[PDB]
Amino acid sequence: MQIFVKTLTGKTITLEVEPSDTIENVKAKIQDKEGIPPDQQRLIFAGKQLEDGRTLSDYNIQKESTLHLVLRLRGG
Amino acid sequence: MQIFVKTLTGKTITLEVEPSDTIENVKAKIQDKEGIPPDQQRLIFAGKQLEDGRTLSDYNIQKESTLHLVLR
Amino acid sequence: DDEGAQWNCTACTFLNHPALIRCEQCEMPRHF
Ligand SMILES: [Zn+2]
DSSP states (O other): OEEEEEOTTSOEEEEEOOTTOBHHHHHHHHHHHHOOOGGGEEEEETTEEOOTTSBTGGGTOOTTOEEEEEEOOOOO | OEEEEEETTSOEEEEEOOTTOBHHHHHHHHHHHHOOOGGGEEEEETTEEOOTTSBTGGGTOOTTOEEEEEEO | OTTOSOEEOTTTOOEEOTTOSBOTTTOOBSOO
């Protein structure tokens, strides 16, 4: 299915994903399209920051949903 | 464990804490380091105000997490 | 109470505590 990722600069990225994909998987897809390392990515949906080890289905992220990408380096 | 505490004025205070520290303990550490009385402190993480009797671990606060400090 | 409701950031949609005037995630101001 298709989902979208919107950036702080207002641009829309289109991804192809499955409901069983993890948030970590989604960040890898963003790296593919945008060159941004997963450790620099935070994803927001329905007002919440998404956790790497959960799936899209866990968050009820269905087709044509829009996530928001914030660039912020993960802790060490 | 290192955490950051960002104030409303843009300062990032760096604290040494343990995951088992209570919020009350964290406020005491902020008092020791910065001089702010604990009763004047409100701590916020992931959009929510943190409660005194809970621990950092209760809120899944870990290495290099950023909390926000608002003063009364 | 004076502070009102949590606010969704215009820039990233994060749901913020009403005492914060910059987004916890992206640091953008609430108001502009
Ligand atoms: Zn934001």
